[PDB]
Structure prediction request, 1179 residues.
Amino acid sequence: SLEPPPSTFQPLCHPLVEEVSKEVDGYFLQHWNFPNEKARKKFVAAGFSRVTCLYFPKALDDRIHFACRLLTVLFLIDDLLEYMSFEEGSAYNEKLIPISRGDVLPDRSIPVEYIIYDLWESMRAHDREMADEILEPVFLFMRAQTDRTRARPMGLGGYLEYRERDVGKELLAALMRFSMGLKLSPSELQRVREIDANCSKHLSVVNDIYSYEKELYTSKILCTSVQILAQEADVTAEAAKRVLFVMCREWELRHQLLVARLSAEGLETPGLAAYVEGLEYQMSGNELWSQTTLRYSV
Amino acid sequence: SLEPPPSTFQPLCHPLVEEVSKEVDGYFLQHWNFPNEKARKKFVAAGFSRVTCLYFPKALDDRIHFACRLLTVLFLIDDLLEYMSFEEGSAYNEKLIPISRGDVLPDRSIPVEYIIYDLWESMRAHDREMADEILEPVFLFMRAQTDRTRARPMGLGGYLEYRERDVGKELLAALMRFSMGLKLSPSELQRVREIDANCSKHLSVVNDIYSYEKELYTLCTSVQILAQEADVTAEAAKRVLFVMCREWELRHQLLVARLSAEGLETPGLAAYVEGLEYQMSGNELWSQTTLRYSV
Amino acid sequence: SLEPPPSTFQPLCHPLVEEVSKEVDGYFLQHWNNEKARKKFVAAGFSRVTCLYFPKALDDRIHFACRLLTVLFLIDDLLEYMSFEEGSAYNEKLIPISRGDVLPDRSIPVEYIIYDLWESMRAHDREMADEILEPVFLFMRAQTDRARPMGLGGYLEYRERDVGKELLAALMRFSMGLKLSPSELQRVREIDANCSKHLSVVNDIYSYEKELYLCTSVQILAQEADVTAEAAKRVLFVMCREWELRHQLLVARLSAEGLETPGLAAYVEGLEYQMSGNELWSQTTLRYSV
Amino acid sequence: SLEPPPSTFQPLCHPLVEEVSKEVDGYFLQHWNFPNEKARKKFVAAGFSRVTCLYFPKALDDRIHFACRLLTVLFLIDDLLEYMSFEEGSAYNEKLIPISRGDVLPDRSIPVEYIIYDLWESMRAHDREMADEILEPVFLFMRAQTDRTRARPMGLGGYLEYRERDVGKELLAALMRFSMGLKLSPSELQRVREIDANCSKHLSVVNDIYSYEKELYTSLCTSVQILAQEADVTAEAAKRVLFVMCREWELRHQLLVARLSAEGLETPGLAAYVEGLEYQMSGNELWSQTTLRYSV
Ligand SMILES: CC(C)=CCC/C(C)=C/CC/C(C)=C/COP(=O)(O)OP(=O)(O)O
Ligand SMILES: CC(C)=CCC/C(C)=C/CC/C(C)=C/COP(=O)(O)OP(=O)(O)O
Ligand SMILES: CC(C)=CCC/C(C)=C/CC/C(C)=C/COP(=O)(O)OP(=O)(O)O
Ligand SMILES: [Mg+2]
Prediction:
C-alpha cells in the first residue's frame, strides 16, 4: 500500500477536541433535523469538530468551537446539496447568505436558517471586525458549492495553478485566522502570497492522492493530479500517487525556505510567524484526515 | 549534491573495454585529423569506446569494436558540427550518407570519408543483412543533428512523449541489436513498442537531470519544465524526476513480465529486453561522470 | 489582410463625447506635463475611447470615467520609460492618495490630478466611488511587473479573469449608476468571463505590432497552428464572433431561466457595448499605429 | 447548415474513374469473399475506386488502378479489423507483410493472402524501383491499424503536431507519388517538409469537422472537441473556427510553394507533387462531406 514518504511535519489536534466535540455534536443533535437514527449516528461517527481541531490545532481555546460549528453546518449543507439540482442548491445557499450577514431574520421554524443566523450573530458578538472579515471567504465557498466544473485539456502545471486558487483552501486559511485571532494586514497577507499558493497545492494533491480510488469508483468529469500525472508520464495511478507524494514533500521544504527567507528579509511579523505555523499544521492535518476520513472510503 | 534514489538496475561494463579502447582509439588517433596534441589527449580522456562499452555491455566480442567505431566518429562529427552552420553541417552529413551505403566516394584524402566508408564495408562484411538494418536508423540520427525547431507551448506530457521518439535513443537501441547479433523480425519488435518508448524516456530524463547546470549557459528540458509546472527549484525538480525514472524502471519490469504472462517472450526479445535495462543503468552512470555535462 | 468578419454587435458612442472630450482634454493640457506630444494627446482620443466603452454612462458621470482612463493611459505610457522598481513605487505612491489618506504635492500634476479626481467622485457618489477603489488598485498593481507552459486554453482561461477587463465593468457600473448585488453578479460570471476573453483577444489582435515592437493569443495560436501572426489574427477574429454569439445565447438563457433583473439587463447590454466599442477603437487608434 | 468558407482550391476527379472502378470492382467481386449479396451491394456502393480517383486525380492512366486496388483492399481489411481483437488483427496484418514483400508464398485458398501477393508482384513488375519505395509506407499504416493510442491531456498544438505525423496521410502522399510516377530525391523531400506537415493537418482537421457527429457514439481525440473546450464554445462553433484555420493552411501551402519557387528550389517533380497535394486537400474535403463512413 501507499506508505507516505518522510516528512518533517506532524499532525497535531486541538487540546480541547473532546470538549468542543461534545458541545458542538450535542448542539446539532438537538437542533438539526436528522432523518433516521442511523443518520444521527453517522453524524457523531463523522466527528466534524474533531476534523476542525485537526486542521486548526493552534486555535484560541475560546474560538475553536466557532470554527467547529461553521464547518459542521458547512459539511452538513454540502451533504444535502448532493441530493438537489444546481438550481435549488444555488437557491438554497443564496437564501442563507443575507441571513448569514444578519441582514435578514431566519425562519425560526427551519433549523439551518436559525443555526446560521445565530452562529454569525455569536461570531460578531465575540469579535465583530474579524467575523465580518470571513464573510466573503465563506460566501465565495458556498457559491462554489454549486458551480459547474468545465471539462478542458489540463496538464499538471495548469491543474496545480488552478488548485492554487481553491476557494475551499482559502476558506480554511481565513477561518484559521479567525480561530487564531490573527488580524493580518493587507501588506502582511501579500507577503505570504506564495506561501498560501504553495500550501493550497499541498492540501489539494494530498486529497487527490487519497480520493482517487473513490473518484474513479464513480461509475467512471475526472479532474485530479493523480490521473493527469499518470497519463502525462504514462505510469499507473499508484505510481502517480508515489511521485506526487514526493512533490508534496518538496512543497513542504519550499514552505520552510520561503518562511526562512521571509524572516531573513525582516518581514516575518509576530502574526505571520503564527500564521505560517498554522499552515504547516493544516498540511500535516489534512494528510491525516485524508488517510482516515470515510469521505474518501468506498 | 543529489542522491539518486534506489534502483534494481545494475550497470555492467563490457569486459573488453580496455582492449577495444586501444584498438579503436589508436585507429582514430593519427588517422582522424586532430588539430593538436591537446585535442588528441582530450580525445583519449573522453574514452568513447569506454562510453560504448557501458551502454552495450552484452555486445558480442567480435562486434563491440564496430559500435565503438560508429559512436566515436559520431561523437567527433557532432563536435565539429557545433562550429558549423545549419547550412554547412547539413551538407556535411548528407554527403557521408551515400558513402555509408557504399554507393559513392570514399575520397582517401579526406579522413571522415574513408573512415565512414571503411567502417560500413567492414560491417557489411561481418553481417550484411544486419549492417543494412541499421543504415536508416543512423541516417535518421545524422539528418537530425542539424535540424531546426518549431517553438510552441510544451508541457511535461508533451516533452515526455517527444523524448519517447528521440532519434538518438533509437540509434542506441538499433546499434545494440546489431552489436548483440539480435535481430528478431519486425514483429514482436513491434511488440516491444511500449518498452522502447518507456526506455527512451528514462534515458532522456536522466540526461536532463545531469545536463541541467551546463545547459543553463545561455530551455527544452524536463527539469525546467517540471520546475515551472510544480513551482519548485530545479534541484527539487531533479529529485522528483529521479523518482519518476524509478517508476519507469518498475514499469519496464512489468512490461517484460506481461510479455511473458501472455506468451510473447522470445529468446530474441528476452535478450533485447535485458539489453535495454543495461542502457538505462549504463546511461545513468555515464550521465553522472561525463565531462560532456561539466561546466 | 485584416478585414473584420461580420458582427451583429453595433457599437454606440456617448452623445456628449465632443463636449466631454474637449472638456477633459483642456484639463490635462493645463496641469499635466514636447508640445509635439501636447498634440499627440488631443489626437489620442482618450475620452473618445471612454465614450465608446460606456456610451450609456450618465451625463453627469461620463467625465469621471474619461478623466480616470485619460490618466491611467497617461501613466501607462509613462511606465514604458522606467524600471519595475521605479514604476511600482510611482504607482504605489498614488494609491493612498487615491483613497485620500495622503494629500498630494500641488507641485506634482499626477498627484493632485489623482487626488482631486477621486475626491470629486466620492463627492458625487461616495458609496459607488468607494466600490471602484479595489478594482482600480488591482489594475495599477499588475501594471508593475507567470513564467510557465501556456497553451491557448490556459491563456484564454487566464484572460477570462483579466483585471483591466474587471476595471471596465466596475467603472461602467459607476458611470451608469448601476447598483448590483454580489448575488446578481454571480448569475453573470459566464457572461463576464466570455466578455473578458473577447476584449483581450481583440486587443491582442490589434496591439500585436506595438507589443512585438511575449504573452498574447496571436503568438500562441500562431505557434500551435503553425501559421503567421496575421493568419492567426484572422482565425482569432472569427473566434471572437463565436464569443459574441455565445454572449447572446447566455443573455437569452439568463432571461429564460427567469434570473434577469432590470439592473442585470442593462449590465449585460453594457458589456456588449464594451466589446464592440473596444473593437472600433482598436482598429482606429494610432496607439497601435494604424 | 455548415457553410464551408470560400476557397481557392477545387475538387477534381481522375478521367478514367469509370473504367478503373469497373476494372477494380469486378476483381474484388470475383476474389473477395463477401458472405451474402448485401455486402457486395454495400461494397459497390462504397466505390473505393472513385474515392481513390478523387484523392489522386493527376495519377497516370496506367498506374491509377494500382492505387485503387491497394486502397480497396486496405479499406476492406480496415472493416474486418473492426470485428477482431488487438492481438488478432495485429497477427492478421503481420501475416500479410512478408507476403507483400514477395518473401512468402500466399495461401491460394485465402483471398486476402493471394490478392495482396499478386498486387505487389504486379506493382514491382511495372516499376520495381518505385514499387519497393512504398513498401514501408504501407507497412507502417497496416501496423498502425492495430495499436492503441494512450489518452492524455492535449491542447490544439499538441493534437495538430501529432496529426502532422499521421501515417495514413503519409501513405496517401507516398501512393500519390508512386501513382504520378514522381521519383523525388531525399533533398527534394527534405525541401517539402513544411508543406507536407501543413497538408497533413489540413486533411485531418477537415476529416474531424465531418466525423464529429459520428465520433459522438456513446452507446474523444479530435480538433473539434479540443478547440471547443479550449475556447469554451460549442462544437458547431469550433467547426466554423477550424474551417477558417483550414483556409489559412491553404494560403500557407501557396505561400510555401511560391517561396520554394522564388528560392530556385522548386524542381519539376516537386512542382507536380505540391500541386498533387492541393488536390488531395480539396478532394479529401468533398469526400469528408459525402462519405457514408461519417454518417449515423
Ligand atoms: C466540504 C467542505 C465544507 C469543505 C470546506 C473546506 C474544508 C474543511 C476542507 C478540508 C476537507 C476537504 C479536503 C474537503 C474536500 O474533499 P474533496 O475535495 O476531495 O471532495 P469534494 O471537494 O469533491 O467535496
Ligand atoms: C554523438 C551522439 C550524441 C550520439 C548519440 C548516441 C547516444 C544517445 C549516445 C549516448 C550519449 C548521450 C546520452 C548523449 C546525449 O548528450 P545530450 O543530449 O545530454 O547533450 P546534447 O544532445 O545537447 O549534445
Ligand atoms: C483503409 C484506409 C482508411 C486507408 C487510409 C488511407 C486514407 C487516409 C484514405 C483517405 C480517406 C480518409 C481520410 C479516411 C479517414 O478515416 P478516419 O480516420 O476519419 O476514421 P478512422 O481513422 O477513426 O477509422
Ligand atoms: Mg496589447
Notes: Chain B has one domain: 1-295. Residues 234-261 of chain B form the longest helix (28 residues).
